[PDB]
């Protein structure tokens, strides 16, 4: 029945699709991102997903017990996979906090991101609110109050702290009402995001200069397709969207799906995930192209007005087409007045503005809140879109917390003096308290640091070790015979070669390329805000900052060789 | 004034009469330039005003610039005021019902936007659907009976 | 369960409640109408309704067969009761035609009843559209094109003819889909009218000068409470709203309700009917009072402006409170200029405008279409309200056609060569063809003539003869013993005296009072439009017009003494 | 003009300059009546205009009614124009930008 398809849709659609994918796509060329995305999708989203579902269905055990039985060497992979989800949850909830804040600021008139404040002498608008737009300022200053560097930390604020607290409380309340939320309700939840995205696509396709965004998003230019930092971040974005490495899919299809097909399931999941990502990365980029072309026309109009007011020209003469003709003409009439005015003529082009308009980790927010002020009734659509994002957030949040609660409420050592609600609240409280780093003044930098490495590299390595283990330690022929005898169908050599050969070579090649291009350039530069100019400068990471960058991937991936040693000291006696 | 602006209306001193006479002089200049192809320097002292009443009311006539015995006919002044009425209105914040030139009537505002019987279209679609359901029902009740 | 209550609500709410009741209430003093309405309600809406339901449940036969068995004298009461409904259906469908037309004219901008046309010289608006309002003109001229008298008939128009044809076709289609329309659908149909009435009450209570309408509607003045033409038309309005006389309620609770209570049923029905009528006669009168106070303020403003422009006065001096002071002051300053201007000073008062503002049989239309132009988005509410009225119309129409179809599809003489659909369509076509009198130029006058007498007097007499028969020809004691033995409950002496004594005396007294006040004044005057002045003048009925006035009640009530004679010639042999 | 009115803008002949000088004279009259409590009959010939450019641009100063050597200071003219700017705007259909 259609219930299976709608449950699958609910499974797939998350936050890596409507929030993370556009931020990654804009950052790495746009056009030069889908090609690597589709490549990594077909080569590592079909085979490893199906392999993981098949193992979870075959062993019918938890995330840790399965790899415990496959070999005594490989027990710690479950511990690492659980630590990964633990790292995920904390910074993950901040995205729900932000949507909470934006939602609370939607019951006003006018909306605070639609106008700029006034200066002290009440003549014009604020100086910072003019360099940036009305929305970039509201994001970087009103809801974040970012510092111009990483060393100027400051102190914990009180508004984002409260929003994050409320987010943790509401996820607590949703988890206390049983570890189930669907049933006769999937038809509404799985459909609302699609409906709101259709609405916003209708709105954003009727904006002047929209085709520029789609052109920038689809058409690839072969100069950053040779960037290794694009391939790896495209593959691990897939790894992050499907849920690999988190040990959730293994434990899901373990006490479920007795003899149903795993191939059809994995294929539908991967297809709907990629389709939602590609469809959501278009409604954003139409509005992005609109913003870029608007800023470009503004550059042009400002320069034209300066030239008109300076010498003297009939208003409306120098518009946008004779600009170069008149620029040249004002070199044989009176260059004495022109030369000393040259350092003020702004040189603006559309490409340089499509490249850097709203780039950053708040792209989804700034862009979506930018297409609300240009709407008929703004508060309604703002409330609707932000409630949609909150639903997606609570969904992905409960789905990620399942992978950390269940491998804890089953061990018969810790479940003695602590009941279910108590330990759930304890984990929630520790997470809420550790997530207070991201409510400081330089908290967005720490959020960005915690996002990429901790969410990507560990899981990329763990799925690799999982595949190596299932292929060359348990026996490929043994497994295919087992699955034939269990399900009654033989897997094609297509998947048989994808499991063994292509993925475990591609992942290692992608890792060594990125590690080499890290070793041949040196230290890496992240970003900044530069409130005094209104653009993202690229300041360097401090030395103490690289410490946490190392420690994250270490403490989330070095749990394998310590399990392989604890299982070696116990095998001595 | 009170009808048009409410409790936001200015008071009508003699500087307002100065501005009114200058507006009428400007209108006469424009009409004689754009229609008669002549350039005549009407001033505010060539607009003669009489019978000033407190309900804002007066008569005026116009004289050639320096020939006091030369009165521009009433018809040409009516034309010159028709040509520039929307500007004299704006100078005072009045709207053609608060600034009445008795004898000069505004004659605009034609409505146009219907291409036919917009209602006939819905009537026809509903009638089509209804007759189709009717024949379906007759056929069903006939062949099944 | 609540299904019974909702089915009862669907039973009660019709068109005599939302269309006919306000038109009658405004016509007869307003305040001096509810008092007679409630009196006649309590004295003739409880007892006769319960008696009719009880007889229909006791005999378990049709409308004609029951009175056939009660006595051979009384067979023709069913024929008369059927002829009544036949007379009803034809002019009844015109009300659905009009709502159809108004609905079709709701997909425009601006709506045609919201502005006036222009004159020939394009200086101002139309002359007739200014005397009347923008809505009275659109009703009397655009959708009706009424003639200034009854003798100027003219020819059948083609727009209202088409609307009436479509109405008959759609009622045909609804009747061809089985003689049942409810079931799991009552919760929506029975609720939509009340929701839309709540909406319009919310809108109409926030209009300046609304309390005047409610004051005029509720507060009675004792000078027209002595008008006999108010009592009779208030009692027979009840008779028309509950469905008495039509023989539909007898045939309804005949093959149904085995041993359930009839008292509770009749009480709920009467209460919800009267409640619906009184609640709907308030949303209209709030807007009516608004219209009246607006027209009064317009009179005052026009007179003030004339006085100001005439002599000379500072604009804004003579407003509405010093009007009499200044009127008197301008008699000791220069009466030489005042006297010759006296025949132009309009004398306007609020009472004389509340008495005659929108009076007529299109009151519901003109008033409701007047509170749409004063709304935020007009087309939406217009479409909603007119679709509501169309639902009510089709409902009451099918309910009235049931009483004419079923006593025809059962007689085993005519059902030989004509199947069900064929005879249904034949009656529908004959009705559609006879209802073409009401699409002429003087068609509204014929509609008004056919409405009152044919819908009221026959049924008022038939329920009287029904009660006399059931009380003094079948035996009161026999019937009460039968009902006690059948249902197991004794009826109180309350209903026992209401059946026998109070109603058969009150109806005859009300009839002789009205017939006397017809004989002591002479001929009656109906109304006219007087397009050249913009108010309803009261021209006389022509002599040939009284012919149909007589023939209607004759041919719909004189079927009793011919049955009593046909049953006398057969009892001779 | 083209920035404010679009393809609905009038052309700026010397009758428009006449109306501008009359507006400035009216503003000066009003300021000297309502603030200085004096009645001075400024005219359109007391507003001296210079440097007329085709991008609509000029300088102006104001002189006492019949004393050509008496120039009203720039500060009082600024005050008189602040007091009546919303009216000079309306006379030309312009909007302070
Ligand atoms: C946020 C971080 C998340 C942390 C979540 C991790 C939770 C599990 C951590 C441990 C997983 C690593 C496996 C290491 C092997 C255990 C060591 C050992 O057996 O001691 C040898 C131990 C002897 O070691 P010795 O100290 O060297 O002599 O053998 C024993 O005699 C211990 C007696 C066993 C008592 C039974 C207790 C039952 C609870 C066990 C279940 C816990 C595993 C959870 C797996 C769930 C699948 C069903
Ligand atoms: C948004 C982030 C925050 C969200 C909200 C988080 C807040 C939730 C945290 C809740 C923490 C407390 C949970 C309450 C659970 C129910 C309370 C209850 O039922 O109490 C009954 C009751 C509470 O006291 P009462 O007022 O007398 O009812 O406690 C008892 O009387 C039972 C006797 C307790 C015996 C103590 C001995 C236990 C240990 C034995 C020796 C070993 C020591 C090791 C201890 C283990 C600790 C790790
Ligand atoms: C555009 C959105 C997606 C479009 C696709 C719509 C949905 C497709 C449904 C999938 C069809 C499978 C139905 C069930 C049958 C299972 C398939 C199966 O048996 O596989 C084993 C099948 C068995 O073959 P054997 O080697 O003979 O055993 O393996 C194959 O040989 C098929 C290989 C096809 C490779 C995938 C298709 C594309 C590869 C070529 C390069 C693609 C360029 C990427 C650019 C894309 C741009 C958008
Ligand atoms: C829009 C107008 C609506 C019109 C709807 C009215 C439909 C019914 C009209 C007749 C009602 C008045 C009753 C008059 C008594 C009938 C006259 C008579 O019996 O002839 C004497 C007749 C002798 O009369 P003679 O001509 O004087 O000798 O007796 C017979 O021998 C006739 C043989 C009877 C044949 C059986 C036919 C079965 C159909 C009868 C059912 C019709 C009544 C419908 C009632 C439904 C309740 C179940
Ligand atoms: C909006 C208002 C208007 C709404 C729409 C109203 C329009 C509906 C009106 C419909 C009128 C026709 C109904 C059609 C019914 C089905 C047609 C059909 O099945 O025909 C099969 C068929 C039609 O011809 P076909 O083309 O050969 O199929 O007719 C036959 O072949 C059957 C043979 C007929 C025998 C004739 C003898 C019957 C009478 C015997 C002597 C007595 C004479 C008295 C006649 C009684 C008349 C009162
Ligand atoms: C405001 C909207 C309506 C308000 C009423 C809310 C609903 C009322 C539910 C009806 C109560 C009956 C429940 C079931 C019991 C059946 C009644 C029963 O047994 O009757 C036989 C009952 C048996 O009595 P017996 O004579 O001892 O056998 O008859 C009576 O004695 C009751 C007589 C009461 C008359 C009706 C009430 C009003 C009469 C006084 C004048 C009214 C002024 C009208 C102005 C109204 C202004 C709005
Ligand atoms: C806009 O473009 C012009 C020309 O492409 C730039 O002017 C050039 O500046 C370089 C130095 O940076 C000179 O060597 C060239 O001779 C200049 N060109 C000309 C034609 O004079 C200009 O710098 C650009 N705008 C900005 C803001 O840099
Ligand atoms: C002033 O205007 C009058 C007209 O209003 C002129 O009068 C005309 O004078 C010529 C000869 O000078 C006569 O032939 C006309 O018959 C006069 N017209 C009228 C209507 O009387 C007068 O010439 C003008 N004076 C100046 C100095 O321009
Ligand atoms: C308005 O009211 C006035 C006074 O109530 C009416 O004037 C009276 O007219 C009658 C004749 O109809 C005279 O006999 C009275 O002497 C008049 N009264 C006064 C005070 O002069 C007037 O007719 C009313 N308006 C209209 C239109 O009839
Ligand atoms: C014209 O205005 C000037 C000022 O601009 C007046 O000049 C003043 O004259 C008096 C004596 O007449 C001197 O004491 C002042 O010093 C002069 N002021 C300046 C600034 O020079 C002049 O009087 C005015 N003339 C008339 C006729 O009013
Ligand atoms: C604008 O404000 C600044 C201080 O914020 C002040 O120094 C300056 O004088 C103001 N501008 C004017 C024209 O007064
Ligand atoms: C641009 O300037 C040229 C003169 O160099 C002129 O001929 C042309 O009309 C201008 N274009 C527009 C659109 O005004
Ligand atoms: C108004 O129209 C009528 C004819 O409808 C015409 O006789 C009259 O002259 C017009 N008014 C004016 C001022 O021309
Ligand atoms: C009405 O007129 C009187 C003079 O008769 C005046 O005193 C009063 O202020 C006026 N009322 C209003 C509201 O203007």
Residue numbers in the entry:
A (entry chain D), C (entry chain B): 11 to 583
B (entry chain A): 624 to 768
D (entry chain C): 624 to 720
Cite, word for word, the article reporting this structure.
Angiotensin-converting enzyme 2 (ACE2) is the critical cellular receptor for SARS-CoV-2, directly binding with the receptor binding domain (RBD) of spike glycoprotein (S protein). Here, we report the cryo-EM structures of the full-length human ACE2 bound to the RBD of the SARS-CoV-2 Omicron subvariants BA.2 and BA.4/BA.5 (hereafter referred to as BA.5) at an overall resolution of 3.1 Å and 3.2 Å in the presence of SIT1, respectively.
The Omicron BA.2 subvariant has quickly outcompeted the BA.1 subvariant since Feb of 20223. To reveal the interaction details between ACE2–SIT1 and the SARS-CoV-2 Omicron variants, the RBD from SARS-CoV-2 BA.2 and BA.5 subvariants, respectively, was mixed with ACE2–SIT1 complex at a stoichiometric ratio of ~2.4:1 for 30 min and applied to SEC to remove excess RBD. The cryo-EM structures of Omicron BA.2/5 bound with ACE2–SIT1 complex were determined at an overall resolution of 3.1 Å and 3.2 Å, respectively. Taken together, these mutations of Omicron subvariants remodeled the interaction net between RBD and ACE2. On the extracellular side, the remarkably extended TM7 and nearby segments of SIT1 are connected to the neck domain of ACE2. These structure-based analyses indicate that ACE2–SIT1 complex are tightly coupled through the connection between TM7 of SIT1 and the neck domain of ACE2, and the π–π interaction net on the membrane region.
